[PDB]
Symmetry: C3
Subunit: 380 residues, 3 copies
Amino acid sequence: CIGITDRDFIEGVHGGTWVSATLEQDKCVTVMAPDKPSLDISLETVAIDRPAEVRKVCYNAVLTHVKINDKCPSTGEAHLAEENEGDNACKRTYSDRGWGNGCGLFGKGSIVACAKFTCAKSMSLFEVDQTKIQYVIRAQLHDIKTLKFDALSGSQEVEFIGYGKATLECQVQTAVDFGNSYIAEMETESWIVDRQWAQDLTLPWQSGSGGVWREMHHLVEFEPPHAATIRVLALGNQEGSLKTALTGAMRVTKDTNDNNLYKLHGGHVSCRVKLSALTLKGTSYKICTDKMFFVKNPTDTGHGTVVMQVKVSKGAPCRIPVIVADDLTAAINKGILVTVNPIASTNDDEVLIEVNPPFGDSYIIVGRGDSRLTYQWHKE
Amino acid sequence: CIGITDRDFIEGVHGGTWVSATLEQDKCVTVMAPDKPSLDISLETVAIDRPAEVRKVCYNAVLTHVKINDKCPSTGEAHLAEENEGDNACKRTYSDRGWGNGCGLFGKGSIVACAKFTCAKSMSLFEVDQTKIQYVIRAQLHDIKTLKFDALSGSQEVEFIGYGKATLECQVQTAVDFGNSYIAEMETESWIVDRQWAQDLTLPWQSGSGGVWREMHHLVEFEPPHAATIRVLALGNQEGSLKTALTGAMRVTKDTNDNNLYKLHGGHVSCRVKLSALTLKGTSYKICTDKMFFVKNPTDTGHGTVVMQVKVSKGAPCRIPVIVADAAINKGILVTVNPIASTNDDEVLIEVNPPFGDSYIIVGRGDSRLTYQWHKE
Amino acid sequence: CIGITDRDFIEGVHGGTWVSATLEQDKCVTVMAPDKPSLDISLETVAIDRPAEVRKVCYNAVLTHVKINDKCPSTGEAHLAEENEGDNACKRTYSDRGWGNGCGLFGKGSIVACAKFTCAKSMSLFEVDQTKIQYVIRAQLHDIKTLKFDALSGSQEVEFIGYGKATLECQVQTAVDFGNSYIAEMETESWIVDRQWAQDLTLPWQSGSGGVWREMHHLVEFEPPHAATIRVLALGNQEGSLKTALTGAMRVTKDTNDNNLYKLHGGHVSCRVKLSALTLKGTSYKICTDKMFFVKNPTDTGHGTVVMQVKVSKGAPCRIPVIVADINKGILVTVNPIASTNDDEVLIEVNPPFGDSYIIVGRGDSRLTYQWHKE
C-alpha cells in the first residue's frame, strides 16, 4: 500500500515505539523495519449490525369491513364495537334524518363509521447506535490478522512475527451524523434520511414496539354522510411521492456476505499502534508537479463532499496538492481536504481524492503550474 | 493493579515520556520506575450530575370537580368558564333535547363537560448532556490525588512526588448512546429508555418547563351524553404496563454519596499521561495456558454485550485470550482491554460483544480452554 | 503567547518528534528549537456553515378572506373548496337554524368557515451536523499558514521553513451538546435552544422541506357561530413570550463577513502535531505565589460554567492554580491557565458544583476568593 513517513512514527530510548496513522477505506498504510518483514495495515469495512427499528411509515393502505351504525333523532348516540378495537379507523358525525329515511321527526341523527385499517406497503426507519459502530482493520506481514473493532472497544491486542506484541488504540470518524439521521428501508432499497424529515411525513406510522397504527386519517377519507351510509375510501399508493422525495438522499449498501450489515460509504479510523522498541523506516514524499489526468471527474458523495480519481504518469512517488478556491488565481484556499496523504505510490497510478468545497461556486484545483488540473463545482 | 507494558510507554531523548492507557471502572493501572515509588492510576467513577428534565409522563390520572353546561335547541352552543382554564379536560357534543328534558322543541342541544385533571403518579425523563459527563480518576503513590474530569475538560494538570509534574489528557467513551437515550425515573427506580419509545407512549405528558398536561384524553374517557348529563371517567393506573415494558431495560444506579449523580456501569476512559523525562519499567504478560473456571457465568449487560468472570488456577501473571466463534475464527469483539490476572486464584471481568444468532464463547487455549453457548436476538 | 512544557513534546531516537497540545480560541501555543525560528499555533475559529433548517415556528399570524358556507336542516353538510387548500384554517360546526334566518324548519344546520393563514413572523430552527463542524488553526513562524479543519478531516499536513513538513491530527470538543440542541434564529438574533423545548412550543410550525403550516389552531380562534356567520380572529403577536423565554438562553454570533457561518465561541481542539526529528525547548512553569486581581468578575457562560479574568502583579511567567471548594469539588475547564507576562490578563473558566461554592484562585494571603451560586 503506502509507506509511513518519518514524523508518522516515533521510537523511544526506552519502552516502545508508536505509529500514528489515519486509515480510510480503499486505502492501506505499510510499515517497514530493518531485518524485519514489512507490515501492511488497511481499513476493510465500517459497518452497522442490525440497527434497531424505531418506526414504520405507511405509504399504501387498505380499508375493509366498513361498518356503520346510525340513529334517528331522540334515539341517542350511535356506537360500534370496533370503535374500541385498535385496528379500526372510525368517524363520528351527524346526518340529516327525516320521514324520507324512516325517521319520525326531522333532525340531525348520530352516525358512526368504522373501517379496518391495514398497511399494504410500509417504510422502515432504523436508528444507529453510535457506540455499536464496527470497523475491521487487517494487518498482514509480507500471516494475516483480522481485527474486529467497536466504537466502545477501541483497544485491541495482537501479536506479530518479529514485531512481537502490539496494541491498537482506535477511534472511528463517520462521514454522516447519525444523531440527526435514520436509515430508511423501502423494499430492496435503503437510504439515509434526516430524522426530522421522516418524522414530519404526513402518513400513518407505527412505533417499533408495534402498538397500533397512528394518524390513519392521512390515508383515509370519510365522504360526506348520506341518510344512513358513509363511504370510506383509502387513498392511493404514495410510493411515487416518497420515492421522488428520496432522490435527494444517499443510498446505503447492505454488505454482500452477511446482508444484514449496512456498510458506510466513507469516514475514517484514527489509530495509534504501540509496539515494543523497534527502529522503523519512513519515506518522505515530494509534491508532484507534472502530468495529471482525470480518470474520474469529481462527483457528489451525497454527504456534501466530492470525490475524484486522478492519474499520475510523471514522475515519482509524490504527494498531490489539492485546493479549492473561488478564484482561478488560487490565492486563497476555501476548501477542506478530506483525504489524508493523497499520494501516488508509482507513476501511471490512480488515486482517490475527497474534498469539501465551499457553498456556492468554486474551483477545484489539483497540482500546480501549467500541469495543474481544474474543475468547476456548484454546491447547494 | 496491573502493570504497564513496554509498548504502553515511550521515553524521548528530549522532552517528556508518554504513557498510554485505557482505564475502565473496577480496574487499575500502575507505573513503576527504578528507585521511584510505584504510581497507581484508576478510573473511580463515571457519572452524570443533575441531568435536565425534558418531560414528565403520567400513568395515573384523577378527575374531580366535574362540571356540565347544557343548552336547548335554538339557544346556541353551551360554554363553561372551565373551557378557558388550562387545568381542565373538556369535551363538546350534542344531546337529544325534547319535552322530556324541559325543552320546547325536539332537536340536538349543545352540551359541554369539563373535568379537573390531576396526575397522581408520573414518570420523569432526563436527557444526558454528553459534554457534561464526569469521570473521576485517582492516582496514589506507594499520597492520594483525586482528579475530576469532564467531557469538555479533557486535559488536567497534576504534580507528583519524584515523578514531578504530569498532564493527563483523557477521552470518555460511554457504553450506551445517549443521543438515542433518556434516563427514566419511576419513583425510586431509574432506567435507560429509547427516546422514541418514550415519545410514542400513548399517555398524558408535560414539558420540562412545566406548562400544562397534554393529550389528557389518553387517561380520560367521556361517556355518551345523556339528556343533561355526562360521566367522565379516569382510566386505570398504568404502572403495571409501564413496568412490564421496562423489564427489558437496564437500571441506572444513583450515588452512594452525592445522590444526584447517576453512575454509568460501563464505558471506558482512554487517557494519555505526560510526564517529564524519566525511565519507567515495563512488564510483559504471558498468555494464560492452563486451568481456569467460570465463577460467574456469562450474563447479558443490558447494553448488548455479555459479561463473565473467570478464575485462573495455575497461570501466574497472564493475558487471558478470549474469542467468540461460530475450527474457531472469532466473529466477536472484545470489549474488555487487558483482561489480565495478576495472580492465581483471583477473578477477572470479561466483557464480550458476540454476533447476532448463536455463538460460542471460547476462553484460553489448549484442552484447558473454557467454552459457552450463547444466543443473541 | 504561551510556550510548551517539557512533557508536552517527545523526541525519538528514530522517526519524528510529537507535540501534543490543546487549543482553545483566543489562545496560542508556541514551540521553539535551537537555531530555529519560533512557531506559533492558535485556534482562530470554530464554526458551522449553513446548518440545515429543520423547522420554522410561527409567532405571528394573519388571517384573510374569511369564507363561510351555510346549510339548513335536511340540506346536508356544508362545504367549501377552500377546505382542500393547504393554506386555510377551517372549522366545521353547527348553528341554530329556524324561520328567523330563512330556514323552513328548526334544527341544527351545518356550517363551515375557512380563513387564509399567513405567518408574518417566524422563528427558524437549524440542526447542527457534528461531523461538519469546522475549525481553523493558524501557524506562523517568527509567513503565516492557515489550515481549515473538519470533524471528519482531522489529519492535515503543512510545511514551513526549518521545521519541514508537519502533520496535524485534531479532535474537536464542543462546550454545548448539539445532539440535544437547535440554533434558533429570530430576525437578526440567534441562540442555542433545547430541542424538546422548541418541539413542545404551542405554536404553528412548518417542516424544513417546506410544505405547509401545521397546528394553525394555536394562533387562530373561531368565535361561536351565529345564524349564518362565524368570526375568525388571529391571536396577537407572541414575540414577547418567546423572547422572554429566550432570556435564559445562550446567544450565538453569526460572525461579520460571510455570515451564514455561526461561531461556537467555546469548546476546545485537542491536537497532536507530528514533526520530523528535532530537538525542541520546553519551558517550566512555577506556581504563581502572590498578588492577584479580578479585572473581570466571575460570570455565567450560559452553558453551566463561570468565566473570569485575572491580572497578576507579581509572579512573572507562572501557572495559576484554581480550586472550587465546598480540596476542590469542581472542574477546571481552562487549559494551561498561565500568565505569560506580568500585567496581562488570563482567562479562567471553571465548572462549579451545584448549590453554593467558594472559588479560590492563587495561594496564601494573596489567594482570591469568590462566592458563587449555581442553581
